[PDB]
Amino acid sequence: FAFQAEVNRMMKLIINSLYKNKEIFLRELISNASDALDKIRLISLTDENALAGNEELTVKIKCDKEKNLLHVTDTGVGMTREELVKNLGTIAKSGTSEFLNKMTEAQEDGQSTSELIGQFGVGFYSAFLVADKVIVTSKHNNDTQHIWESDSNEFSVIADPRGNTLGRGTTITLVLKEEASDYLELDTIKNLVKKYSQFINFPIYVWSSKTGKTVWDWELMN
């Protein structure tokens, strides 16, 4: 079961190389954060206690060069354990068996190679254009806080032992590929965030520096 994995993994490295502008992954994550915030905002207009777990409605992005991570946190509706498993799990899980079934299916169904490569640049899966691993921490009003992890081959989900630290919402943590180190650069992230947040109805911030000494804090990008 090691050879199939070498073909699976390699197949992805080639398709990723077709994406010169991988920056779209950030547009997709912001779009999902926006959708989650709109959902809880809509709910709050009917239920006065819907925001009890976390009164703010924001998207906050932070870089961690030491750990080589990019965090995109929203205080949207969040996801229950089942949602992490059914929604993200089926989407991210493209291992040996999954990738082949989708291939033959695409083969039979008459799906163009173009239609295939395009699936790599849209939605949640687009995170893998720049990440070796994706970690999702989420808290939905109807469940406890959970952590989901995937390398695009397998995925696991376990209750967060830190308990409810998000209040409500989701953090998408990307363990970036070596060649995606550019997305750990403050100037690049601020530029891209500003680029894709022009239509979201909520404040988006990037953890940035400001200069008695250099202090870091949330900087409004839209």
Ligand X SMILES: Nc1ncnc2c1ncn2[C@@H]1O[C@H](COP(=O)(O)OP(=O)(O)O)[C@@H](O)[C@H]1O
Task: List residues binding a second copy (CB under 8 A).
Answer: 3, 6-7, 10-11, 14-15, 17-21, 24, 103, 106-107, 110-114, 116-117, 120-122
φ, ψ of residue 118 in degrees (nearest 5): -65, -30
Binding mask 115-154 for ligand X (x = CB under 6 A): --------xx------------------------------
What's 130's DSSP letter? T
Burial of 6 by CB count in 10 Å (0-12 exposed, 13-18 middle, 19+ buried)?
exposed
Q: Is 196 helix (H, G, I), strand (E, B) or coil?
A: helix
Q: Which stretch binds ligand X (CB under 6 A): 32-40, 46-54, 101-109, 194-202?
A: 32-40
Q: Which is nearer to Mg ion, 32 or 73 (CB)?
A: 32
Of 99 and 202, CB closest to a second copy: 99
Residue 207 contacts residue 62 (beta carbons within 8 Å): yes
Has 153 been labeled as part of a binding site? no
Q: Which is nearer to Mg ion, 196 or 208 (CB)?
A: 196
Q: Would you list the DSSP string of 35-55?
A: HHHHHHHHHHTT-TTTTTT--
Instruction: State yes or no: residue 170 binds ligand X (CB under 6 A).
Output: yes
In angstroms, the CA 45 to CA 124 distance is 27
Which positions touch ligand X (CB under 6 A)? 28, 32-33, 35-36, 74, 76-79, 87-88, 91, 123-124, 170
